[PDB]
Amino acid sequence: SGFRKMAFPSGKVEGCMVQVTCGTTTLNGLWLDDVVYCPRHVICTSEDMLNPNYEDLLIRKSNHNFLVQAGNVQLRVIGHSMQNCVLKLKVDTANPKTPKYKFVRIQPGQTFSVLACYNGSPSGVYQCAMRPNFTIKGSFLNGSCGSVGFNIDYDCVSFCYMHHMELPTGVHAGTDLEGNFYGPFVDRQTAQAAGTDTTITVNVLAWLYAAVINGDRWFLNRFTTTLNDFNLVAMKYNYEPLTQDHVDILGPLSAQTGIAVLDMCASLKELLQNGMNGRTILGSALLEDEFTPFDVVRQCS
Amino acid sequence: SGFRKMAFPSGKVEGCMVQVTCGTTTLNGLWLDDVVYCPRHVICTSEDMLNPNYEDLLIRKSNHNFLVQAGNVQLRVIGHSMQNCVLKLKVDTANPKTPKYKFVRIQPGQTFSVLACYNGSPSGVYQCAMRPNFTIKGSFLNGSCGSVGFNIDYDCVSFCYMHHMELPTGVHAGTDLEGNFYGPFVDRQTAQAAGTDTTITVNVLAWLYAAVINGDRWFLNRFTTTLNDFNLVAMKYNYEPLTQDHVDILGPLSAQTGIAVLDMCASLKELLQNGMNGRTILGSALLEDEFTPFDVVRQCS
Numbered sequence: 108s109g110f111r112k113m114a115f116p117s118g119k120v121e122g123c124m125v126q127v128t129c130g131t132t133t134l135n136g137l138w139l140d141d142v143v144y145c146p147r148h149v150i151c152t153s154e155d156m157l158n159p160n161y162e163d164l165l166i167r168k169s170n171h172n173f174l175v176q177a178g179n180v181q182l183r184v185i186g187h188s189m190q191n192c193v194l195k196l197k198v199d200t201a202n203p204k205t206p207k208y209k210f211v212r213i214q215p216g217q218t219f220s221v222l223a224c225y226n227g228s229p230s231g232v233y234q235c236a237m238r239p240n241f242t243i244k245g246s247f248l249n250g251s252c253g254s255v256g257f258n259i260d261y262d263c264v265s266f267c268y269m270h271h272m273e274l275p276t277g278v279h280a281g282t283d284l285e286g287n288f289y290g291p292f293v294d295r296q297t298a299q300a301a302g303t304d305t306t307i308t309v310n311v312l313a314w315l316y317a318a319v320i321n322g323d324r325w326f327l328n329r330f331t332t333t334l335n336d337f338n339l340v341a342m343k344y345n346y347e348p349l350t351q352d353h354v355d356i357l358g359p360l361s362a363q364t365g366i367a368v369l370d371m372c373a374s375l376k377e378l379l380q381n382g383m384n385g386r387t388i389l390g391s392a393l394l395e396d397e398f399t400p401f402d403v404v405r406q407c408s
Numbered sequence: 409s410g411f412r413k414m415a416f417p418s419g420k421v422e423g424c425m426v427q428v429t430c431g432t433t434t435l436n437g438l439w440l441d442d443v444v445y446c447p448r449h450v451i452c453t454s455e456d457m458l459n460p461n462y463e464d465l466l467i468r469k470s471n472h473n474f475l476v477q478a479g480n481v482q483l484r485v486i487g488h489s490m491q492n493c494v495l496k497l498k499v500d501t502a503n504p505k506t507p508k509y510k511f512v513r514i515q516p517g518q519t520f521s522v523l524a525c526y527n528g529s530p531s532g533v534y535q536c537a538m539r540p541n542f543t544i545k546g547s548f549l550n551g552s553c554g555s556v557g558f559n560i561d562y563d564c565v566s567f568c569y570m571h572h573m574e575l576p577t578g579v580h581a582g583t584d585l586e587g588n589f590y591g592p593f594v595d596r597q598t599a600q601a602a603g604t605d606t607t608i609t610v611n612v613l614a615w616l617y618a619a620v621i622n623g624d625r626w627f628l629n630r631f632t633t634t635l636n637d638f639n640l641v642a643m644k645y646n647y648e649p650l651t652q653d654h655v656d657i658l659g660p661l662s663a664q665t666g667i668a669v670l671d672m673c674a675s676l677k678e679l680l681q682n683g684m685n686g687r688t689i690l691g692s693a694l695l696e697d698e699f700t701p702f703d704v705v706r707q708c709s
């Protein structure tokens with residue numbers, strides 16, 4: 108029993124992390140087979156980051172301009188190319204610790220583990236959600252850029268995030284591993300701001316099922332509601348609409364606890380309208396939305 | 409910027425995790441050099457766990473009774489001995505992935521990373537604190553026993569916890585790696601219960617400094633207080649007394665933010681007496697006590 112914000116074991120990713128240096132700019136790279144992936148802004152100086160032209164900046168660079176260190180061992184770069192907002196540095200040596208991996212783009216509402224790194228040195232691991240507004244609420248200091256987000260299915264590492272920048276509200280923006288940004292963000296330090304965020308309704312419902320399975324029952328009631336009447340309430344409290352697929356996805360958890368999805372929706376309506384009254388759910392005094400139905404089943408089955 | 413409950417990278421520990429089977433009982437072991445460490449109750453059946461005599465149970469066992477699998481490879485056990493509540497199984501092969509390590513016993517109030525494992529297979533990593541009552545609030549299902557807690561200093565793994573049992577309130581009890589239990593708990597499924605817990609005052613203060621550094625300032629005030637007058641309030645709300653060493657340990661954080669320790673104590677007094685008023689601190693609606701001064705400096709420096 109018990110429920111914690113749990114990250115995937117980070118070992119398989121730790122063995123892929125390297126340092127990439129161009130001039131006086133250094134950040135983290137991902138070394139898979141004979142390619143190192145890193146943010147393209149590694150070729151920018153402090154001045155350039157205002158408004159760079161990356162094609163012009165890259166054409167003026169050669170292989171010897173890129174320093175790659177795999178811990179102590181320096182890797183000889185034998186090729187460079189730009190793919191969207193990521194740089195691909197072809198190197199001398201194939202990473203002998205290269206795991207089975209895929210590059211997958213995730214959806215808002217889905218979770219992943221972040222291995223925060225500094226100068227190619229792993230510092231810590233934590234669980235994130237992709238916010239509805241395509242930002243993440245991470246923990247990143249200067250030199251954390253190139254740090255990756257990932258899930259592990261069996262022995263396969265699904266890489267979904269590379270960290271690029273911090274936004275004005277202190278939230279974080281990055282790309283998939285093909286170098287395509289999540290949300291309407293660009294790799295220049297300018298006047299960009301996160302759009303209005305919403306609460307991930309299906310995740311909050313999954314978390315209430317986790318609470319029931321772990322013996323927190325106080326918020327349950329005899330009432331039920333309709334998907335329409337619930338969605339009217341959701342809109343008012345800045346929650347995402349719930350769909351038939353959402354209730355279908357919550358089916359297994361519904362069956363395990365014996366509480367119908369629309370019954371649990373009735374509980375959420377009451378919690379939104381009334382609050383908690385000095386009471387807690389799984390050691391929290393607010394409604395948690397960074398656990399997916401899968402995350403709950405994983406930890407509570 | 410940003411603040412997350414961050415675990416240490418788990419790679420160095422992942423490579424030490426094995427499965428130990430005796431009869432129909434299976435759990436996790438820690439393989440360091442040519443020794444595998446596991447809970448001694450692996451030699452107990454469902455019936456024995458009521459009231460076992462481990463000396464009698466072990467004397468009736470031989471090396472061939474212990475099945476150890478390092479993933480696929482089976483390890484030949486060539487010796488067995490009991491050290492307090494842990495079993496030491498001497499094996500054929502020295503673990504080639506054995507990191508630099510120490511066995512350290514931690515204090516109530518200190519934090520560590522847990523690598524939750526099932527049948528010698530790592531499942532996830534999360535951060536814990538040793539509660540004042542020597543329990544931990546972990547996430548453990550059947551087959552999680554033998555899972556270890558640890559810190560990483562430089563390249564050295566300081567192992568501090570091995571998981572043994574779950575208590576009636578759904579909290580967890582275990583030993584250091586010398587097999588000595590944290591708190592007044594024993595390895596038999598009986599009527600044991602956790603003593604009354606308290607809030608780790610110094611940790612809550614460190615977390616308020618983390619909030620200030622990340623731009624949460626609303627709870628600050630012009631007031632200060634004395635260490636005595638604060639400790640009178642602490643006692644009432646079931647907080648641990650604050651000592652001169654606690655304020656000394658908070659010195660660096662005090663200097664970084666320019667808020668005196670006793671000024672921050674005044675803020676905590678108000679938060680305890682008044683509450684938060686629908687407001688949050690670092691994405692929490694209650695006062696968090698599982699971040700040490702070290703944990704904050706680590707993430708906010």
Ligand SMILES: C[C@H]1C(=O)[C@]23[C@H](O)[C@H]1CC[C@H]2[C@@]12CO[C@]3(O)[C@@H](O)[C@@H]1C(C)(C)CC[C@@H]2O
Nearest residue numbers: 153156248249250251252271272273274296
């Ligand atoms: C790598 C990311 C990052 O961390 C950036 C951005 O959020 C993003 C891109 C650039 C840095 C940073 C500008 O702002 C940063 O937040 C900051 O950490 C960087 C320094 C320390 C001020 C150095 C200059 C540097 O331009």
Ligand SMILES: C[C@H]1C(=O)[C@]23[C@H](O)[C@H]1CC[C@H]2[C@@]12CO[C@]3(O)[C@@H](O)[C@@H]1C(C)(C)CC[C@@H]2O
Nearest residue numbers: 454457549550551552553572573574575597
């Ligand atoms: C390994 C720990 C553990 O997980 C124990 C205890 O908390 C502790 C020791 C024993 C098991 C468990 C008795 O209670 C358990 O909570 C439970 O998970 C175990 C089973 C699944 C019921 C099987 C029998 C077994 O006796």
